Write an enzyme that holds these catalytic residues in place. Structure first.
Site: not given
Lengths: 512, 102, 132, 104, 517, 171, 509
Positions: G51, G84-85, G377
């Site tokens: 992550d 996110t990444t 998430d």
């Protein structure tokens, strides 16, 4: 204990004094390459003349300190001529410095210094003309012309005649001695370049709108003026108050009693007789409630520098103290007025019992062209208030300096020996104010001097250079005027410092 | 550094009331010598403030026996209080002295 | 300047000790007159408290002898310095109440005035130092 | 020289002297009160109850034995209320001496 | 002691001015690339305005230390144009070295820079006619604030913001001889609802307090009780002692204070001004008791908030509960309640038709970051309109008037042929640096950009046809609608030649080791 | 203090808690695999490929290793005795493991209820030291064995006792 | 202050943001690499992550271009969930493409204006890939199990993912048109294994109450309240606090026994069988509750009480400001079921059919906390899928599609701006290079193979990265969510241009 002697000591004093003369060389001119001065203060300081900058220098050469102290002595009398004593005495030392290794190690120069400076001061007052009442003037055209002389430097078209006759009036009202800071022109946003106002007392630039600000009077017959020193607000106190509860009527008591003491702040001096409330510190939101309730005028965040000028003309002082709050500390006027010029509420204090601050207020709605107007006026005041003190006025602008250098190479022929080399160097240094202003106005600076000497071999009336007409002319007929005494003081002071430093080639120190 | 004297004052205040107990501790042993001689020859009262209240001899033996035990309970906590305040302050004498130096 | 502040710190601290010598003598008077009123006003006499009562006499600090009381109605108070007079209740009562009320006010009125007599001593020594 | 900080120095020292007087009167209040409860619990009226007034003694009821201590607790507590009525009065000047440095 | 004489002075005057002019020329126009700032607290800040950054950057040179007060005079008066005065005056400055490298004395050009500033201001009188009537000229300002909003803080132009902002200024200008004061207006921004939300308040706003919806939520007649005295029990942040004799004494005390609540009602309501506002606050217990007793009250009001409502109404404040009159009450034009944001609570909007002493545009945001960026677009839009309301003098700047006076001053170097001609030449080529810099930060070639409108000056003089910076390929100023105030551009002429005059003021460049130390 | 080295102390600790044996051998296998990693990264093989290939070969190797193994009993107490001590004689200490093998065999046999016989909780196995006594006198006492009692007037031997807990202060 | 010039700032922006983009491209993909966590302060503790969001939290970011990315990394984290990444590498893929343009001469306003038009054009191509799945109950059931494997494997959970995959898609199925996170109650609890995890239809409280109170409540009336017993709340009934007296303690000691008696009368006059209390319930009112049939809950959750009034139709009592006007909740069955090692309260048959409670069962704290963060998430994306039942074809298949559409527009427009559109369409194709490197394959082969696919328009098949081979789309397991990429394309194109806007960087710290 340390010591250094001889010629390598002496020349080291000379070039040390040259560098400070390299600085101020055209600071009487408006121009150069600026230095804002930051010290361990950490604060920004600029200037328009060198004398303020010379107050900033901590000199490291004690021989150079002597040239400061003579120039500060010239500064202490008039406030001008600080540069003139500085440049002339250094260019003496500039031309003498090759002669020292040629053998001017003797002090034979010091006889040549006095014989030069006695003849010169006998020419200055002689060529100067005495006029006050009406000898060629109108009792005002003396002060009108010199003000129009200063205001022709910057290109004000015909308002410079209108701006002249106003600032003539500020000098005659105040006139007690040569002081110019009370006349100090306030830059006013708003107004026009066609209207201009003279104030017989002082004025305040900015005041802010509080609660009931326009519900305070604008017309007074005698402002009883309190120049307070404290900040008022409800949030300046801290609360810990305590009493017992048996109802909700006790809730009203704790809040109201903290407001009576704020109302006790004002009623002590209002019962002393004061009606005008002035503080450079802010007024509280609850504190300005009672000021509209008192129906007495207040003004917060006024300038402290403008607050000091109120102390002189009104018979006032600084205010609230622990005791002695009476009419003995208050200031008085006869007329109050508040004229919003631009967008700021601009106050009028006039009708003062003492003629101790007569300032002129210039308008135009600007910052740049008005600063162009002020700096010419600040030197216009320096001429005309000194023109009142001395009835005999000579022409400035290097008119007489080139005439002296004409007179003295002739006198160099009459002088024999080594002392004529002093008089040749004496006539050499006189051109230094033409040397800068020719390169400032834009000239082959030396070739101007060659032209001015022919008009001294043929005429010799007032021939110098113009920086504001940008040519060569008779500077008295170009109306560049200033009284002759400060030149005579400068001729004595420049001769005094120059002969003194060369008389010391032996300096004694103590690092303990 | 105020932290030096503060741990000492909190220790020394506990010692002063503890030294009060020890003269009481001896005299609690004195009265047990005197209660052992009484079996009905002389009865005892209790002096408690402005009132002098009747006791018995078995009532007296438990009374001074309890107060003997309450002293010993306050002795043992001070031995914990002694070693803790002397070791915490000893750590403080090194670190808080360096705070005033630099 | 802190240099003028430092001289007034030491001259204020030394004058505190001269005050504590006077307050403790005022302090030592108060409990002794306090014991006189409260013990008398609760017993009030053998006469006023309604005949024969109990007693355990003070022969010493640890030796009390139990007996029956009944005296005659007087109290031989102690004045000091080779003086004992026999008294009654009414003479002994109103005198000590006056000594009770003053000994608090002797402690109260002086302890403010001692705090300003200290302030006279610290202020006096610094003005002569700054002049000469 | 400031005379308001002369009042401010006197004000804070009067805060300190009042709170200490409350604490010593509270401990005397509980001392008499817990002296009441212990002597009632042990041995009420059987033949007589001796009570100390100096070194002479009076014999009477158990509840009257409390009654002398009950009165002094009433006198002491009324002082504690009057002491806190002076603790409250020393706080109102403290909120007002901050403004008087700016006024005079 | 080191003295940096002449050129050696000016080399120190180059390097800070070279730095600050290059960071502005990447920031002209809506194609201006943003300025990033790490604070002295180590805090990320991103603007595109110089007067922000020059205030935020720690200035470390006589040139740099000047620029705080120089850009202070521009933003307080004009607003936008913080970058252009720095790009121009530095471009005269670096050219003045080349003249000093040509051997031209630094004084004779500083003499001529002022005269070069005169003929440019002379040209602006001919440029871009100065008559724009009051109803019409709102719409180009609606277009001008569209340019400031629609490219910098919000990509697609909040329409409600640019149209309210031209309306707040006529509220004050009419009362103030066709001029606005910037303390009689305020750009008020409070996030919490929607970023589309934008209001005009003729007075101020306070958050209206109601404690229960079961208690009546009132709003009434256009008169406000601007009070500091207690209509509800106040709180100056401290503590009494609580003591009651009996519980039934407290049962009667609730019945006693209820009559005391009505007495605070019957004193205020008989004077008028049924909206009661008291400065010091209280809990919600006796708050909804007064709401039940049929007068609304606002609690926990900020300190200066009672002052700004007083000057907006024009009336005074009631100091004490025993002093009671209507002149110490508010004189309001409209008191109505509108919900704060969309979701949290309600305000009490106190509008006045009497005194425009605080006319506040009230905007909202859905983001805390965007609103000061939105307000900074609104700060400069409210400053340029002050120029128009006095005189309707406008300029078509952005590339049209820059090349136009650069023709004129270069012509005035030939019409007025003397020594200042290179000073006028240093003025004229520096004018070309600006529309270069609008295309330099743009994706367009600025070298091509100076060519096109130069041919248009051969075509047409006094242009309303200059370059674009929206890459539409339509180079105008009246159909590209890039129009500014003539007073503002003229002020930029005065400020840029001021700085070059300012660094020329003494001939002293010596130090004792301490003149910048 | 190195992150590859800090995985090594984690590698053996997991071998400590899951097995407690093979803790030296669990070190040597990991450095052996890193030799294989260097050849393939120099060859130019992605480590994602080398990761998933080893995870497959791990599942594949223990399958073939299981066929190498021989099934033994877990409910026969005697089969557990022969299987354990031969490893115990294979290890270093067997000087006291001779008499202490069947004591452990009888100990686990009480918690071997099924033939599946799960992994083992050592969180019911309590080790208790007695200061004197003999290795010959070491034995298995059921329930739990406590240290020093503190009994003011309390009982010494109570039949059918009630185990209580105190979690409150008396002061 | 340090005034960073633009020639220096581009070097700093390239070393600042791309190295961050190097880290997140490692921890992308389940087959992809990992990152050792080195704490920036003293005593560096190590974790191994897949992550990139945790990397920003551990390793401090003080690169000014990369500190912009931290703000962008937070938005896709919280408001979007997954992505996110992915958004942070994609902006770095843009900034690498800008380097050669900056190397040539090219202004960034060329680069910005090209990428703005190219983003909106690919956005319509992103809308071209919008395919519905709520047209069928089964295809929407097939839609939910597609994305549930995608988000959970992206945020470090793939071992017991499938047990959570079956339970989570069921509760989202009951939402039915409205995406809800205040109806799905999220409960972590130690106990059991990850195959012991549970899905409750309704609401749950982790309360062990046993048989002292009623635990079986049929046809419930639910009072949602915060009214204590010993706290002496508002609406006073007796004595209040006072000073300056010593005999007033008797009225205070007696008034506590009246208030606790009166609140039993207050609770019974609601008509309820369940009194839910946030505060502690004293023993004497508690034993009066169980005999009549009133359930008593003490130490209730601060957020659970507020979620209880929503799912049951009730209302909070607002700390006893509403003694009777507080509305009641109603549900069908209240049952105490031992899930794992613990006794649990199951509010079944609540008024909201949307309302469910997932019950996470981790064997340790290490697995239980990482499961919920991935599961939260997931459910944010699945709730956005309730509003728009659409997918886009993952595995870089949509990345290959939109880059073609930009390339077509870059080959119709190209004035000044679409020099950037050429750099735009490469950076979109730079993302499938990462996943082929995450799978560990020839990225140049697999992209040019996939570029050959969408050139004629083979869009229904992209690369199944488990072998890296081309495979089915429109549901595969790899066909990703529509709601994710439309947010990721929005932010990555946005902040990268903002990085191009900041050339006038000034450091005063």
């Amino acid at each position: 204990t340390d010591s250094s002697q001889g010629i390598p000591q002496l020349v080291s004093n000379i070039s040390a004094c040259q560098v400070i003369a390299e600085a101020v060389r055209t600071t009487l001119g408006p121009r150069g390459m600026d230095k804002l001065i930051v010290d361990g203060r950490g604060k920004a300081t600029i200037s328009n003349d060198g004398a303020t900058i010379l107050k900033l220098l901590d000199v490291v050469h004690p021989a150079a300190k002597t040239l400061v102290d003579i120039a500060k002595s010239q500064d202490a009398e008039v406030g001008d001529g600080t540069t003139s004593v500085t440049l002339l005495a250094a260019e003496f030392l500039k031309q003498v410095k090759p002669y020292v290794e040629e053998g001017l190690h003797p002090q034979i120069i010091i006889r040549a210094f006095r014989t030069a400076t006695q003849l010169a001061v006998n020419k200055i007052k002689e060529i100067a003309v005495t006029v006050k009442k009406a000898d060629k003037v109108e009792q005002r055209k003396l002060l009108e012309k010199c003000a129009m002389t200063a205001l022709s430097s910057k290109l004000i078209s015909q308002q410079k005649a209108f701006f002249a006759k106003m600032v003539v009036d500020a000098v005659m009202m105040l006139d007690d001695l040569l002081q110019l800071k009370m006349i100090g022109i306030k830059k006013v946003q708003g107004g026009a370049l066609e209207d201009s106002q003279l104030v017989a007392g002082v004025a305040f630039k900015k005041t802010f709108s509080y609660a009931g600000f326009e519900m305070q009077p604008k017309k007074y017959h005698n402002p009883k003026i309190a120049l307070l020193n404290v900040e008022l607000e409800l949030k300046a106190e801290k609360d810990n108050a305590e009493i017992r509860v048996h109802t909700v009527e006790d809730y009203q008591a704790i809040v109201d009693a903290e407001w009576n003491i704020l109302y006790d702040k004002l009623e002590k001096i209002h019962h002393s007789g004061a009606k005008v409330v002035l503080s450079k510190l802010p007024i509280g939101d609850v504190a300005t409630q009672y000021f509209a309730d008192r129906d007495m005028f207040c003004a917060g965040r006024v300038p402290e520098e403008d607050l000091k000028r109120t102390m002189m003309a009104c018979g006032g002082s600084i205010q609230t103290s622990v005791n002695a709050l009476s009419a003995d500390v208050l200031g008085r006027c006869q007329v109050f007025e508040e004229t919003q010029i631009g967008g700021e509420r601009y106050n009028f204090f006039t009708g003062c019992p003492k003629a101790k601050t007569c300032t002129f207020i210039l308008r135009g709605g600007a910052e740049q062209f008005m600063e162009e107007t002020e700096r010419s006026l600040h030197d216009a005041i320096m001429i005309v208030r000194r023109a009142i003190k001395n009835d005999s006025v000579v022409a400035g602008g290097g008119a007489i300096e080139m005439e002296l250098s004409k007179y003295l190479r002739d006198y160099s022929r009459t002088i024999p020996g080594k002392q004529q080399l002093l008089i040749g160097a004496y006539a050499k240094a006189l051109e230094i104010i033409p040397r800068q202003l020719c390169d400032n106005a834009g000239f082959d600076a030396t070739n101007i001097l060659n032209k001015l000497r022919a008009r001294h071999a043929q005429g010799g009336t007032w021939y110098g250079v113009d920086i504001n007409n940008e040519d060569i002319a008779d500077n008295f007929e170009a109306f560049v005027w200033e009284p002759a005494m400060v030149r005579i003081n400068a001729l004595t002071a420049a001769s005094e410092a120059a002969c003194l430093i060369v008389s010391v080639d032996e300096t004694i120190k103590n690092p303990r | 550094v105020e932290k030096y004297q503060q741990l000492q004052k909190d220790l020394s205040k506990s010692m002063s009331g503890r030294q009060k107990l020890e003269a009481q501790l001896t005299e609690n042993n004195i009265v047990k010598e005197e209660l052992a001689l009484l079996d009905g020859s002389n009865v005892v009262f209790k002096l408690l403030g402005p009132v002098l209240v009747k006791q018995e001899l078995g009532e007296a033996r438990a009374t001074v026996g309890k107060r003997l035990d309450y002293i010993t309970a306050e002795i043992k906590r001070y031995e914990s209080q002694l070693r803790d305040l002397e070791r915490q302050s000893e750590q403080q004498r090194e670190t808080l002295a360096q705070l005033q130096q630099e | 300047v802190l240099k003028k502040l430092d001289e007034q710190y030491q001259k204020y601290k030394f004058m505190e000790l001269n005050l504590a010598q006077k307050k403790r003598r005022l302090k030592g008077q108060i409990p002794e007159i306090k014991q006189t009123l409260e013990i008398l006003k609760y017993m009030q006499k053998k006469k006023e408290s309604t005949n024969s009562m109990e007693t355990r006499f003070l022969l010493a600090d640890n030796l009390y002898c139990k007996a029956s009381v009944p005296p005659t109605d007087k109290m031989c108070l102690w004045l000091g310095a080779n003086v004992m007079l026999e008294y009654d209740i009414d003479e002994a009562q109103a005198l000590l109440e006056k000594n009770l009320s003053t000994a608090t006010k002797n402690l109260d009125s002086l302890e403010e005035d001692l705090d300003f007599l200290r302030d006279q001593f610290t202020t006096t020594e610094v003005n002569m130092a700054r002049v000469y | 020289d400031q005379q308001k900080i002369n009042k401010f120095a006197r004000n804070t020292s009067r805060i300190t002297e009042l709170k200490e007087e409350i604490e010593v009167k509270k401990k005397q209040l509980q001392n008499l009160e817990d002296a009441c409860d212990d002597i009632m619990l042990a041995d009420d009226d059987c033949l007589m109850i001796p009570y100390q007034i100096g070194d002479v003694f009076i014999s009477h009821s158990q509840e009257e034995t409390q009654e002398m201590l009950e009165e002094a607790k009433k006198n002491l507590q009324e002082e504690i209320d009057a002491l806190e009525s002076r603790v409250e009065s020393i706080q109102r000047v403290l909120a007002d001496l901050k403004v008087q440095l700016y006024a005079k | 002691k080191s003295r940096l004489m002449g050129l050696e002075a000016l080399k120190s005057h180059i390097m800070a001015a070279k730095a600050v002019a290059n960071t502005m020329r990447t920031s002209l126009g809506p194609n201006g690339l943003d300025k990033m700032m790490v604070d002295k607290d180590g805090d990320v800040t991103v603007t595109n305005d110089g007067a922000t950054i020059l205030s935020m950057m720690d200035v470390d040179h006589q040139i740099a230390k000047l620029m705080v007060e120089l850009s202070k005079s521009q933003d307080d008066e004009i607003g936008d144009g913080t970058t252009g005065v720095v790009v121009l005056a530095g471009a005269l400055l670096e050219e003045a070295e080349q003249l000093l490298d040509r051997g031209i004395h630094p004084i004779r050009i500083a003499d001529g820079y002022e005269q070069a500033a005169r003929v440019a201001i002379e040209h602006l009188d001919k440029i871009s006619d100065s008559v724009l009537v009051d109803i019409k000229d709102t719409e180009p300002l609606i277009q001008t604030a569209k340019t400031t909003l629609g490219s910098k803080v919000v990509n697609s132009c909040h329409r409600q913001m640019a149209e309210i902002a031209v309306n707040a200024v006529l509220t004050v200008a009419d009362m103030e001889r066709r001029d606005v004061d910037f303390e009689l207006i305020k750009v008020e921004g409070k996030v919490g609802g929607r970023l589309e939300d934008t209001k005009l308040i003729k007075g101020v706003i306070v958050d209206k307090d109601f404690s229960h919806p079961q208690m009546p939520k009132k709003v009434e007649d256009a008169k406000i009780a601007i009070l500091t005295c207690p209509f509800e029990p106040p709180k100056p942040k401290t503590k009494h002692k609580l003591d009651v004799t009996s519980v039934e004494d407290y049962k009667a005390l609730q019945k006693y204070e209820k009559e005391k609540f009505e007495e605070m009602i019957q004193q205020i309501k008989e004077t008028g001004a049924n909206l009661a506002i008291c400065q010091w606050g209280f809990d919600d217990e006796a708050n909804h008791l007064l709401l039940q007793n049929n007068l609304p009250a606002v609690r926990w009001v900020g300190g200066p908030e009672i002052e700004l409502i007083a000057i907006a109404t024009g009336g005074r404040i009631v100091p004490r509960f025993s002093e009671l009159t209507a002149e110490k009450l508010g004189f309001a034009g409209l008191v109505q309640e509108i919900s704060f944001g969309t979701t949290k609570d309600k305000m009490l909007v106190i509008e006045q038709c009497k005194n425009s002493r605080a006319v506040t545009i009230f905007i909202r945001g859905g983001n805390k970051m965007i609103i000061e960026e939105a307000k900074r677009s609104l700060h400069d839009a409210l400053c340029v309109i002050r120029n128009l309301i006095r005189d309707n003098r406008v300029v078509y700047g952005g590339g049209a008037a820059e090349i136009s006076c650069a023709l004129a001053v270069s012509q005035e170097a030939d019409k007025c042929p003397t020594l200042e001609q290179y000073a006028m030449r240093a003025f004229a080529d520096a004018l070309e640096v600006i529309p270069m810099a609008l295309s330099e930060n743009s994706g367009m070639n600025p070298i091509q950009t100076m060519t096109e409108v130069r041919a248009r000056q051969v075509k047409e003089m006094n242009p309303a046809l200059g370059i674009d910076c929206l890459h539409k390929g339509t180079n105008d100023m009246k159909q590209q609608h890039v129009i500014e105030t003539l007073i503002g551009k003229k002020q930029q002429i005065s400020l840029a030649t001021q700085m070059v005059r300012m660094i020329l003021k003494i001939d002293d460049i010596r130090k004792p080791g301490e003149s910048e130390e | 203090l190195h992150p590859a080295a800090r995985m090594l102390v984690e590698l053996s600790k997991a071998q400590d808690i899951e097995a407690g044996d093979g803790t030296t051998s669990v070190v040597i296998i990991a450095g052996s695999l890193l030799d294989s990693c260097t050849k393939l990264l120099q060859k130019g093989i992605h480590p994602t490929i080398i990761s998933e290939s080893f995870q497959k070969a791990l599942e594949k190797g223990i399958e073939i290793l299981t066929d190498m193994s021989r099934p033994v009993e877990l409910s026969d107490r005697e089969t557990l005795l022969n299987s354990a001590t031969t490893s115990l004689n294979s290890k270093v200490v067997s000087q006291y493991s001779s008499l202490l093998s069947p004591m452990s065999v009888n100990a686990v046999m009480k918690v071997i209820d099924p033939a599946t016989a799960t992994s083992v909780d050592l969180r019911d196995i309590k080790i208790v030291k007695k200061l004197g006594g003999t290795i010959d006198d070491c034995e298995l006492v059921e329930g739990l064995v406590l240290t020093q009692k503190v009994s003011n007037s309390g009982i010494t031997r109570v039949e059918k006792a009630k185990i209580g807990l105190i979690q409150f202060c008396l002061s | 202050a340090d005034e960073e010039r633009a020639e220096t700032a581009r070097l700093t922006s390239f070393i600042g943001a791309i190295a961050i983009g190097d880290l997140v491209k490692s921890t992308l993909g389940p087959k992809g690499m990992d990152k050792i966590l080195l704490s920036s302060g003293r005593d560096a503790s190590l974790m191994v992550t897949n992550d990139g969001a945790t990397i920003l939290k551990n390793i401090g970011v003080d690169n000014p271009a990369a500190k912009v990315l931290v703000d962008m990394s937070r938005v896709q984290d919280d408001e979007v969930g997954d992505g996110t990444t992915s958004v942070t590498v994609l902006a770095a893929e843009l900034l690498r493409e800008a380097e050669s343009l900056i190397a040539k001469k090219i202004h960034p306003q060329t680069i910005i204006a090209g990428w703005r038009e190219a983003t909106k054009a690919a956005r319509e191509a992103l809308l071209s890939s919008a395919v519905d799945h709520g047209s069928d109950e089964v295809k929407f059931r097939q839609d939910l199990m597609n994305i549930a494997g995608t988000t959970l494997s992206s945020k470090l959970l793939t071992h017991h993912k499938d047990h959570f995959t079956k339970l989570a898609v069921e509760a989202v199925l009951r939402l039915k048109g409205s995406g809800n996170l205040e109806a799905i109650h999220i409960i972590k609890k130690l106990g059991g294994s990850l195959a012991d995890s549970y899905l409750d239809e309704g609401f749950l409280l982790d309360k062990k109450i046993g048989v002292n109170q009623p635990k079986r409540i049929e046809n419930a009336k639910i009072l949602i309240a915060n009214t204590g017993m010993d706290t002496d709340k508002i609406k006073i009934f007796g004595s209040r606090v006072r000073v300056d007296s010593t005999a007033k303690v008797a009225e205070i000691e007696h008034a506590e026994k009246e208030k606790m008696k009166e609140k039993v009368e207050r609770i019974l006059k609601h008509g309820i069988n369940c009194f839910i209390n946030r505060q502690l319930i004293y023993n004497y009112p508690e034993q009066l509750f169980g005999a009549a049939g009133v359930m008593a809950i003490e130490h209730a959750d601060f957020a659970g009480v507020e979620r209880l009034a929503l799912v049951t139709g009730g209302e909070i009592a607002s700390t006893f400001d509403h003694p009777e006007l507080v509305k009641l909740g109603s549900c069908k069955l209240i049952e105490e079921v031992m899930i794992g090692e613990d006794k649990l309260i199951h509010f079944s048959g609540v008024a909201l059919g949307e309302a469910c409670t997932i019950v996470l069962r981790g064997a340790t704290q290490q697995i239980l906390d990482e499961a919920e963060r991935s599961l939260h998430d997931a459910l944010c994306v699945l709730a956005q899928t309730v509003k728009d039942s659409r997918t886009v074809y993952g595995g870089g298949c949509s990345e290959m599609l939109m880059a073609h559409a930009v390339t077509q527009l870059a080959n119709r427009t190209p004035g000044k701006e679409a020099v950037a559109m050429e750099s735009y369409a490469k950076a979109l194709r730079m993302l499938p290079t990462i996943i082929a490197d995450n799978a560990g394959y020839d990225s140049a082969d697999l992209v040019a193979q996939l570029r050959a696919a969408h050139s004629e328009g083979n869009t229904t098949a992209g690369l199944d990265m488990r072998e890296g081979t081309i495979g089915d789309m429109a549901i595969l397991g790899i066909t990703e969510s529509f709601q994710v990429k439309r947010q990721v394309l929005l932010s990555a194109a946005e902040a990268a241009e903002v990085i191009l806007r900041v050339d006038n960087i000034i450091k005063a710290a």
